[PDB]
Design a protein around this ligand. Sequence first.
Ligand code: NDP
Ligand code: NDP
Ligand code: PYC
Ligand code: PYC
Lengths: 332, 337
Amino acid sequence: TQTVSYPQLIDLLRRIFVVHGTSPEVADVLAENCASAQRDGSHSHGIFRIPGYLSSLASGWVDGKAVPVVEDVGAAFVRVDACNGFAQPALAAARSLLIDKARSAGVAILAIRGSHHFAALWPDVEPFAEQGLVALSMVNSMTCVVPHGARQPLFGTNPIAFGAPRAGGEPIVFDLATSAIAHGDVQIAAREGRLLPAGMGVDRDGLPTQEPRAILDGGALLPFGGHKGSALSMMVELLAAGLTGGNFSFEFDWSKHPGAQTPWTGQLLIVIDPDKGAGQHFAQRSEELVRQLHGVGQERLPGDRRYLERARSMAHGIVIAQADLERLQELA
Amino acid sequence: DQPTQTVSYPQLIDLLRRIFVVHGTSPEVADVLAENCASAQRDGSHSHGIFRIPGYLSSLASGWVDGKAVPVVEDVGAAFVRVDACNGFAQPALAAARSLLIDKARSAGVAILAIRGSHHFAALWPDVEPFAEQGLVALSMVNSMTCVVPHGARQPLFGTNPIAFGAPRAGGEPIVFDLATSAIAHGDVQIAAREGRLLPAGMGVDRDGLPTQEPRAILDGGALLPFGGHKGSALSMMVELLAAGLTGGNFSFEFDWSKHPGAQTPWTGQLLIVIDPDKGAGQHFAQRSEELVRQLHGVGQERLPGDRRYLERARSMAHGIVIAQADLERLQELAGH
Ligand SMILES: NC(=O)C1=CN([C@@H]2O[C@@H](COP(=O)(O)OP(=O)(O)OC[C@H]3O[C@@H](n4cnc5c(N)ncnc54)[C@H](OP(=O)(O)O)[C@@H]3O)[C@@H](O)[C@H]2O)C=CC1
Ligand SMILES: NC(=O)C1=CN([C@@H]2O[C@@H](COP(=O)(O)OP(=O)(O)OC[C@H]3O[C@@H](n4cnc5c(N)ncnc54)[C@H](OP(=O)(O)O)[C@@H]3O)[C@@H](O)[C@H]2O)C=CC1
Ligand SMILES: O=C([O-])c1ccc[nH]1
Ligand SMILES: O=C([O-])c1ccc[nH]1
């Protein structure tokens, strides 16, 4: 293996995106995002995704030079047309306006449509919590999850992310796919030749399977927590696509674009000033909840794993297989 | 077996309203709770229908909850409303702020209602459904009482903490889900214990933290597990933070009714987010949601969230609400008949 510093990884990835057609602005956003995931140990959404990013860009499936169009449509409502570009640049373009509205009105929504999201969601909500705001986000992906009780896939892996500030530490953040397992991890499991525990998916005939290959080859995934996770996944379709104006997870396909891997959908973000008109401090309440969680024995809270890995990465550098580093350098 | 009888929806509402008034609630509170409880029974939401009347009354009799509390509606932002439930029920507080909340949601595009110091002893779908019937999307969270073990923990901390969601659809009743983040609702654990039966495995543990299917074992020093492992636990944590942390109400472990024999209602809070899905939009959300429903039937999902309740609702309006003869008599007695 090898070791690359966080800032070096960002520069390396930024060069790669520019070399492959993205605007400098988009390259800055994606490089920081991807590098951040690797820094935190979010393996299925770190450098593992570079090949997919590049194959998707090559066909024009996703526009690496798209210019987001921000629409100020309400005292607490912002819409942004991603114009077939990535979701992150669209969020970045409307972020300042969104925060101004959230702080002024108390809460504000950002509805992104026509966007491609190929990353973790915690990077989208954590920054808001770092600034003392609470953020909830939903993104619908690509069809591959069978609704509870159904016979064929329809929903995407549809993740939900939540970020909240705490007085005595880094933001409390959770980021979870509503599918029993993330598709990226099914791909990694297939590559490593590992079987999955029961309940993650079914084969092309709809029969339960533990073989990641069977799931990937015409099969499908199942929602986490049965009917409850399925209901949440339905909500993600409705909020990230139905409300934003973007495609539902089943309203697009890659058949005409060789190598395309990015979903072309949308994203919803709700940002709240938890202390608007409050006779207390939210950050103090959340800190107390953390103290109580430790008190009952929960050593690991959502996000802890990443924060520990993050600290390691900043102190000793990001561990990367020498082979992967060389590949990135050649791509750059 | 217990002989049964039917009572119409309006008759049940009148009966429950009388019960609440006779037992110390204001008329506004009685109207709201009577309709809410009766509506749950009508839809077949047993754990939050008339089954809850005894708990409501014992909570009121003990002085734990103020049945005559007057909600204080606080307009704190263009899109933000807070309500001090003043140790009263959550539903009357929501009713007091409903019009203002809707005005803000339609004007600003989205609006939040943060209720603090409230007691919620019911289903959450009654809270979000009305907004959806008016073309708005609503998401709500309520934290309850400590009994759920956080993922990886050894003792309970979170409440059953439900999340509810309602959205309009062009060709039918609102799309609505209402789920506890625990593996089972505490109310249904009580019903199982009452009926002397066991629960499915993998939903709770006994006082020693060992798996159990005995509802009594869970109720007597035991605890429930979050649904869907670590993900359900994360969602439950979110509910504590949103329904209590953000509103100002107590977390599920921050209230004690040991000094109020008979108290059963959590004294916490509730968060509601109401959105105009078409604010500044170039499309119609209701059309998009109808398409999703069509696609869901297309892939074979016959039962969508809410369908079971809408079916029971239809049966109740056509044949009346089925009620055990003994339960009806008890309700009639409580009403004064
Ligand atoms: N459309 C898109 O862009 C999609 C993106 N994804 C992404 O892939 C992802 C990985 O998601 P998923 O597989 O669901 O992730 P997991 O199942 O690993 O994690 C869900 C989360 O659970 C918390 N968690 C995990 N294990 C524990 C534990 N033992 N105790 C307490 N908390 C725990 C995590 O913390 P922690 O982070 O510290 O490990 C995190 O918030 C996300 O980053 C997601 O955004 C997935 C589908 C679609
Ligand atoms: N603090 C409080 O006041 C608390 C209240 N509760 C209440 O008790 C409750 C009952 O909750 P819980 O036990 O989680 O409910 P369930 O596990 O029954 O239902 C969750 C929900 O799942 C949908 N659903 C259930 N089964 C299926 C299926 N097979 N296919 C598709 N969708 C399905 C339901 O539809 P559908 O409605 O049609 O049945 C509903 O939206 C709620 O009403 C809740 O609000 C729970 C904890 C705390
Ligand atoms: O891993 C997944 O499920 C996924 C879909 C889109 C991005 N990641
Ligand atoms: O059924 C439950 O879990 C519950 C708690 C408060 C009201 N209902």
